Amino acid sequence: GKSYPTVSADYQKAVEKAKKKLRGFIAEKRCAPLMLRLAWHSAGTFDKGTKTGGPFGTIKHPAELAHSANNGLDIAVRLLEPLKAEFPILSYADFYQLAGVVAVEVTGGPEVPFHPGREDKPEPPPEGRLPDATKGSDHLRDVFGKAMGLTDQDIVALSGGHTIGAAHKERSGFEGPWTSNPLIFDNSYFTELLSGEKEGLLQLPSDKALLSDPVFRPLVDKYAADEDAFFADYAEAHQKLSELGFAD
Ligand code: HEM
Ligand SMILES: [K+]
């Protein structure tokens, strides 16, 4: 149900050039996972009932970076500031979401469709909307479903974003990568979740909750068996996530 706004030709030209520049920058800096986390934490605050929060540029605000769920993301924001400055026409909202999309692409992931025109909004959402890694399926549904308005399928596919990167004991407290290949976007997050705890790889309780829920488990299996299917459903869910509250 989207109606995307019209942006000028200059704005579109800027999108295209920023996209390229973000590829090169994110690849060199090895920071795709962090950039994915930044985009996801920007969008993930959306509350459908109130139409508050969501991917509207507020994560750049020190007040939103201070939320405990956002530990470390001040790094991401600082990393992007000089590039963003080359693209003054673009909203921060658009820029961060583009960086999330590129993160996925340059690590070998699907091409998530991108539509410009998000406006930067002045008020960060209240803290406490992003998910708690120590909780389970009900909580996931409360956050992704009742707040954001995404689907059960979307929940499992987006969990797959842990296919890249790692936790840090100084940020969340959790530590290490979910996968043996943490800068490669693939279905390894699901294959590892399926094979049990292997030494040196991370599983959050929230990842584990996928295995015991009657709706989530068949999806984990599908994605572990079929990376093409994971990529399709991941791209659908990321696009939706990046557009929460935008163009409705
Ligand atoms: C489903 C509920 C989720 C929970 C409970 C959760 C929790 C976490 C936690 C605790 C970390 C560790 C942060 C650190 O210590 O550095 C993390 C990292 C990460 N998360 Fe999630 N997350 C979830 C969903 C997602 C989603 C939906 C995405 C994107 C589609 C995502 C992408 C990432 C990425 C890429 C990292 C690694 C960041 C890095 O390498 O610095 N997460 N997540
Ligand atoms: K991987």
User: Residue 154's domain is classified under what CATH number?
Assistant: 1.10.420.10
> Quick one: 230 and 247 in the same domain?
no
**Is residue 55 within 6 Å of ligand 1 at its C-beta?**
no
* Three-state secondary-structure class, residue 52: strand
> Quick one: 244 and 159 in the same domain?
no
Q: Tokens at residue 65, please?
A: 């970076």
- Residue that is written with structure tokens 């993301």 in the block: 73
> Quick one: 80 and 166 in the same domain?
no
Judged by its nearest atom, the ligand closest to the C-alpha of residue 150 is: 1
| Structural domain for 180, as ranges | 131-237
**Left if phi > 0, otherwise alpha if psi is -120 to 50, otherwise beta: which for 51?**
left
Q: Tokens at residue 76, please?
A: 């991401």
Residues 89, 93, 97, 103: what is their CA dihedral angle, to the nearest 10 degrees? Answer: 70
**Is residue 174 within 6 Å of ligand 1 at its C-beta?**
yes
> Quick one: 48 and 138 in the same domain?
no
52's CB contacts (< 8 A; 6+ apart) are 46, 125
Task: Please check whether residue 100 is in contact with residue 35, taking contact to mean a CB–CB distance below 8 angstroms.
Answer: yes
> Quick one: 63 and 143 in the same domain?
no
> Quick one: 3 and 124 in the same domain?
yes
**CATH number of the CATH domain containing 50:** 1.10.520.10
Q: Tokens at residue 230, please?
A: 């994971």
> Quick one: 118 and 161 in the same domain?
no
The alpha helices in the chain, defined as continuous H runs, are: 9-29, 32-43, 62-65, 73-85, 92-106, 137-140, 152-159, 188-195, 205-212, 216-225, 227-242
Quote the ligand 1 centre to 84 CA distance (angstroms). 24
Judged by its nearest atom, the ligand closest to the C-alpha of residue 33 is: 1
41 is catalytic: yes
Question: How crowded is the C-beta side of 163, counted as CA atoms within 13 Å?
Answer: 27
> Quick one: 32 and 97 in the same domain?
yes
> Quick one: 155 and 165 in the same domain?
yes
**Is residue 164 within 6 Å of ligand 1 at its C-beta?**
yes
Number of compact structural domains in the chain: 2
> Quick one: 225 and 146 in the same domain?
yes
Looking at residue 87, its amino acid is F
Looking at residue 107, its amino acid is T
Pick from 104, 59, 53: nearest CA to 77: 59
> Quick one: 74 and 95 in the same domain?
yes
> Determination technique for this PDB entry?
X-ray
Give the number of other CB atoms < 10 A from CB of residue 183: 16
Pick from 91, 96, 63, 66: nearest CA to 79: 96
Say if residue 117 is exposed, middle or buried (CB neighbours under 10 Å; 0-12, 13-18, 19+).
Answer: middle
Catalytic residue among 41, 61, 67, 115: 41
